[PDB]
Give the backbone structure.
Amino acid sequence: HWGYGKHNGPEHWHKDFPIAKGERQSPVDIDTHTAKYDPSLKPLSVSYDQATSLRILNNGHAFNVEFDDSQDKAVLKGGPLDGTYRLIQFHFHWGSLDGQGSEHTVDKKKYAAELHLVHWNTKYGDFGKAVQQPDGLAVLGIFLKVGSAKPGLQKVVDVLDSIKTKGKSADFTNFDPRGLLPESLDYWTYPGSLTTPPLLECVTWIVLKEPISVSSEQVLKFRKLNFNGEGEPEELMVDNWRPAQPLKNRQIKASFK
Ligand SMILES: [Zn+2]
């Protein structure tokens, strides 16, 4: 099965998922000088006040913080988007070392980690139908650098001991994802894909320019998670990132000058 090891990592995924070599794959390098300001983009609207988190799950590739997406409770709209996109989960990608871990890069710079807040277009009814559409998902990507602690991340960090291994979940109610956002909502946007198999080309990416800072202790706790299940040989969950893919026939647009 696919993963992030030498024998099953990103360079192998195309054998089971040929779209891995497709025309709109993610992540990409964001070349800041080539991205063009688009004055027709609108401000992002991130409306998370009524978010209902439910559970946190180690799925063997990352951990997902899952939300109730059966009503418009936590939604993303505006920016490049037409319509309303409902938050279903967030997760991170991170490195074994502070100098790598992000999926997107900025002028080839790798951040220590990257947060993905995943939303689906309500016009398609359910996430499973949305991923079959070219405008099915909107993913808000936020870079993490190591410095000061992010207070709003600590509740996530502290539950990780209870979901160490693949297949473990824990109750995770009343978590406010607003505590993971930077000050500015300036962003880059482009059409792309899921960054894990099945790699479907269904995502409008919105990548924030401003990173958030997390502490060394916080990222060290991410690195104590395991890819394996309980009772199996320990393989630390680190370096769960796909590298940048060819931009091909795409333009990255900036919301800011
Ligand atoms: Zn992701």
